[PDB]
Design a protein around this ligand. Structure first.
Ligand SMILES: [K+]
Ligand SMILES: [Mg+2]
Ligand SMILES: [Mg+2]
Ligand SMILES: [Mg+2]
Lengths: 100, 201, 284, 23, 201, 284, 23, 25, 25, 25, 51, 23
């Protein structure tokens, strides 16, 4: 899961707001409907380039599925039910909240 | 395609590993001291200053316990060109004078000398061995006539480093490295368990 | 009556006068940011309108002195975060609109100094309406037209040779624009955001003339020293010597068709329909 | 306006352009 | 060691593309060494804690890689392997700046770059330099250069090579075969009653 | 008066005569190879000029002989490394210049044979100036226009059916060019390098006429046999039967609009504004 | 003249064009 | 004309991978 | 319209590698 | 304008492989 | 478990691109296991007979 | 009509366009 935001910048002022790992949320509203938080993630890339006179900032952000992806099973669930395994793995090997 | 290859390679990479192996740990920790240079030549501030790579290395080598920089001379010159970290010498040296050392506060040291020289474009701090620590340049030539040159070196924490800090005592040590003033150089390392956020104090 | 263009303390009045049935003001309203669906299973497309609109003003008029014309060129070309304000003397418009030079255009301002006319300059302005509170930028670049008090001929200097442009049929046009500024869509304002960029502008001088005597020498000198030579990082020095109150500019002919020599049947002379110079770096 | 397999490759840069000076 | 006097002033750039590249960065490496028989964890605390505070996670935001270097018997060498892995994956500036000239400039040289629209006013190391005739462009890569698909492919390629060459006795008896090459041309001329053939094979 | 275009022993004099105040000779000078910076932190761009310029000659004139017209077409279309040399009767130009047929164009030469106008051919020539010493290539390809001495109608043959084009309002236009030749920038000198390529050229015949009698039969025969059939690798035989001294050519109509039937209010006949044929492979 | 991220993807082929026969 | 690099690369993905699918993996 | 293959391939590289970076390596 | 994805990917493959060829494999 | 009540009516789509993807598909997998000392063949008879 | 290294990248969509209503 990823998001790309495109912004105008001046004197690199907005570039400084998006260090790697900083929290980004995207909210959406159509018409008079209340804001829905549609994406939460962290910045992985900030890019600023010359686009025909414009100073264009791209912010690229990844989300929580990265933590399941970039982690490994540490202890062995041989002789566990899938229930017991899910509990063990998520609580030991991932930084996310477990709820049985 | 790449994911499948990568997933395959990883499986073969880790194939012989004992997962009940004895485990060991190394912690990656990071801190920085900013040294700020101010040059005053008879009431005129320098337009630009560099703490040169030689000066950075002098402080680095001193921190390892090799030996402190012996700051001896203020050198003045006639060439404002090519100011960089990479400067090992003045552009064109015209005069050299022995410094007086002052320590106004913790974290700051002043080197000053009285000097007569026309057309000063550049100024530098130099050790006994000839190692340049700073170079500063003026946009317009300064005529010095028994005028005091002051070079001020100020030590500070780099507040951009997350979750690490050089303490007030550490910044004082870096000052004492520059000032030949018996610094409390690194001799030990500690680990603890209080998680209260880092401060200079 | 008369239209005011201002930026802080600087103010220029443009008469908005023309002959007969000519267009003095054109205002275009646009929705460039509507998505009309190109396909789908209905007879008629679904649409979405979710962004600021376009308003463009095209002003035509005449200026009665050259000094004001140079002030207008300077005012349009200048990079500043101070709003450029336009006052239109017609009831269908509000008293002030905040404007940018035309949003992506090389030619926002055309000034023409036609042959046979004195103290009478043709003005064409293209302006884009922007949100008054959304003029955003960091940089500041005051444009200056070089001015001097002489009477002398227009002189092109390249490679140590000076060519004097013929006075006969001599007609001058200046185009000015700021294509590197960004005018950008905003979600729920009527008007777009103006990003003022301290970046390269458009400034072009176009000459037309008849070459009547010493014809080979005049044309050859120009083509030898300007067109058949590599000008390097430098260019032509283009000196007006006080004609129109203008001074010395550094320039280069750009592209495939900046100069043309035209020979017509039955005529003993050469026409130059265009000699076109873009202003280059010298504003250090 | 350019397409690959019916999908647009033109970037929706929200940049305005407006009619050039008339001359 | 080297500085380029002719910097990239605000009037001297004409295109730039300056990112921070943090796509591939991780904060934990575990290196298996000996015959897969011992292990070391290289532990970037800062990045883990920052991800926790940022995202609001219940525990430190670990992102991990596992390596096996089975010929390594020294723990401090295994640490270096892991440290090197982290360092080469870290977030860095890696910008393009487009200018003209600078034929004397090389990778490893330092240059002053001022770009006011970007708020850049710094001395940078040149990582790469590219010269284009025709468009007359000099393209500077500053601080660091990173690849794209070639980075993924080279990382995989090296991994495959390392696993392939395991168990090879490097003190094995060498043998040699020489690739050599020679050719004879047979020319054909055909003559029939004094008339040469138009083509022969 | 006359301009001479020559290649070795072949020489064509073009009268350079026209009516009233028509443009006989246009010369465009350019610098296609200047790099003007599109952006940067200056008000005015930095530039670099490092390569050859461009000089283009456009010659309008008339020829008084169809034989000479075919020689001019042959001369322009021929691939040869022998310089094409142009002599212009005006003092602003050096006595001879080396030329290529217009660099990228399908239309270097236009020859018009209008209705009326016996022994008057309208000539338009576009030529690019190239370095006399930098004409490079391998192959010679001599272009021949098929010529014969008959009187007969223009005949169009396809699939064993022959269509005779109406004489009424008949106009012929021929267009010739060499788009596959490279005119290439060189550093440090004034004029570009000419790479002569023994490759495909442009040769097009356009007809305009009014179909007055046997209207269905005449138009149906052309449309049914040329437009509604697939012609394969072969095409159409276009035979002039000695009109303008021309003979038999193999051609095909190309594109969206090679043929048009125009019907006008209150007229009892059909106008063909264009019938356009391109010459296809025929040399062995 | 076409751009991706502000860089030109048009080739700097130094091949000339000059305007066609007038007609 | 400004071209979206994401849309070029995303559109052409099917065609970049096909040469390898033609050869197994 | 003559398109430079080096320019396209070098410009699009950022986007070609991104799906892979999203998935680990 | 309609662009053939096969043609872009086929034409540019040359240049997509060069960065990796520069680095060995 | 969740249904999006709104749907995509014939008037609500405006582009589509629907393939059947089958270039990766194979019909036999042999897996070596137990330090490579035993093997099992997974056999998709349907695809083999259809080809 | 666009080319990379002389090869056409435009798709040979066999699709007709014809002139619009005059106005
Ligand atoms: K002390
Ligand atoms: Mg300072
Ligand atoms: Mg001391
Ligand atoms: Mg033989």
């Amino acid at each position: 899961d990823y998001a790309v935001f495109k912004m105008d910048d001046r004197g690199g002022q907005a570039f400084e707001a998006y260090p790697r790992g900083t929290r980004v949320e995207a909210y959406v509203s159509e018409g008079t409907e209340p804001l829905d938080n549609r994406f939460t993630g962290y910045v992985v890339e900030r890019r600023e380039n010359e686009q025909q006179g414009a100073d264009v900032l791209e912010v690229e952000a990844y989300s929580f599925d990265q933590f399941l992806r970039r982690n490994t099973v540490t202890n062995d669930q041989t002789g566990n039910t899938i229930s017991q395994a899910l509990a063990d793995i998520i609580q030991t090997d991932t930084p996310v909240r477990f709820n049985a | 395609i790449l994911s499948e290859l990568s997933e395959s390679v990883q499986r073969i990479e880790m194939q012989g590993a004992n997962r009940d192996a004895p485990k060991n740990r190394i912690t990656t920790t990071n801190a920085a001291a900013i040294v700020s240079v101010d040059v005053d030549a008879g009431g005129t501030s320098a337009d630009a200053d560099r703490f040169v790579n030689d000066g950075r290395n002098a402080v680095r080598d001193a921190w390892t316990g090799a030996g402190n920089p012996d700051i001896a001379n203020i050198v003045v010159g006639d060439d404002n060109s090519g100011l960089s970290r990479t400067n090992t010498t003045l552009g064109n040296q015209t005069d050299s004078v022995s410094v007086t050392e002052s320590l106004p506060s913790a974290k700051v040291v002043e080197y000053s000398a009285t000097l007569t020289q026309s057309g000063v474009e550049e100024i530098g701090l130099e050790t006994s061995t000839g190692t340049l620590l700073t170079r500063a340049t003026f946009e317009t030539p300064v005529d010095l006539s028994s005028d005091t040159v002051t070079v001020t070196l100020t030590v500070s924490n780099d507040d951009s480093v997350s979750r690490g800090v050089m303490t007030n005592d550490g910044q004082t040590a870096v000052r004492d490295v520059l000032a030949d003033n018996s610094p409390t150089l690194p001799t030990d390392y500690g680990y603890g368990d209080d998680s209260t956020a880092v401060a200079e104090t | 009556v008369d239209a005011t263009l201002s930026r802080g303390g600087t103010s220029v009045d443009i008469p908005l006068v023309e002959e007969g049935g000519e267009i003095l003001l054109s205002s275009t309203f646009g929705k460039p940011e509507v998505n009309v669906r190109k396909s789908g299973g209905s007879l008629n497309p679904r649409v979405i309108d979710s962004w600021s609109g376009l308003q463009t003003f095209q002003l035509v008029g005449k200026l009665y002195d050259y000094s004001t014309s140079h002030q207008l060129a300077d005012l349009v070309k200048t990079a500043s975060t101070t709003p450029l304000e336009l006052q239109i003397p017609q009831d269908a418009y509000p008293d002030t609109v905040t404007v940018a030079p035309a949003a992506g255009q090389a030619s926002a301002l055309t000034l023409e100094y036609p042959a046979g006319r004195k103290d009478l300059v043709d003005v064409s302005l293209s302006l884009t309406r922007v949100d008054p509170n959304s003029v955003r930028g960091v940089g500041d670049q005051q444009a200056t037209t070089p001015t001097t008090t002489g009477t002398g001929p227009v002189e092109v200097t390249a490679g140590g040779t000076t060519v004097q442009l013929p006075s006969s049929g001599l007609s001058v046009e200046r185009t000015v624009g700021r294509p590197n500024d960004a005018v950008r869509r905003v979600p729920r304002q009527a008007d777009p955001r103006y990003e003022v960029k301290a970046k390269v502008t458009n400034d072009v001088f176009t000459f037309s003339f008849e070459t009547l005597d010493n014809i080979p020498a005049t044309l050859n000198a120009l083509t030898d020293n300007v067109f058949r030579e590599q000008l390097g990082r430098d260019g032509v020095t283009l000196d007006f010597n006080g004609l129109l109150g203008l001074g010395s500019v550094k320039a280069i002919p750009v592209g495939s068709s900046p100069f043309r020599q035209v020979h017509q049947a039955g005529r003993g002379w050469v026409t130059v329909p265009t000699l076109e110079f873009r202003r280059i770096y010298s504003n250090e | 306006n350019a397409t690959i397999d019916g999908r647009q490759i033109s970037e929706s840069t929200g940049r305005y352009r407006s009619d050039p000076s008339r001359r | 060691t080297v500085h380029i006097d002719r910097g990239v002033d605000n009037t001297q750039w004409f295109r730039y593309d300056i990112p921070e590249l943090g796509k591939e960065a991780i904060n934990e490496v575990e290196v298996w060494f000996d015959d897969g028989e011992e292990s070391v964890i290289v532990d970037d605390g800062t990045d883990k804690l920052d991800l926790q505070d940022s995202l609001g996670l219940p525990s430190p935001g670990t992102q991990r890689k596992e390596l096996q270097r089975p010929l390594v018997t020294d723990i401090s060498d295994a640490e270096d392997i892991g440290r090197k892995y982290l360092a080469f994956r870290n977030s860095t500036l890696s910008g393009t700046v487009t200018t003209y000239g600078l034929y004397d400039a090389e990778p490893g040289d330092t240059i002053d770059i001022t770009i006011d629209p970007r708020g850049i006013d710094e001395e940078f190391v040149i990582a790469a330099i590219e010269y284009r005739w025709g468009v007359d462009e000099t393209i500077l890569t500053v601080v660091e250069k990173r690849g794209d698909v070639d980075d993924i492919l080279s990382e995989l390629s090296e991994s495959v090579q390392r696993i392939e060459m395991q168990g090879a006795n490097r003190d094995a008896p060498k043998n040699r075969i020489t690739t050599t090459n020679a050719a004879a041309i047979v020319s054909v001329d055909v003559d029939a009653g004094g008339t040469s053939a138009d083509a022969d094979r």
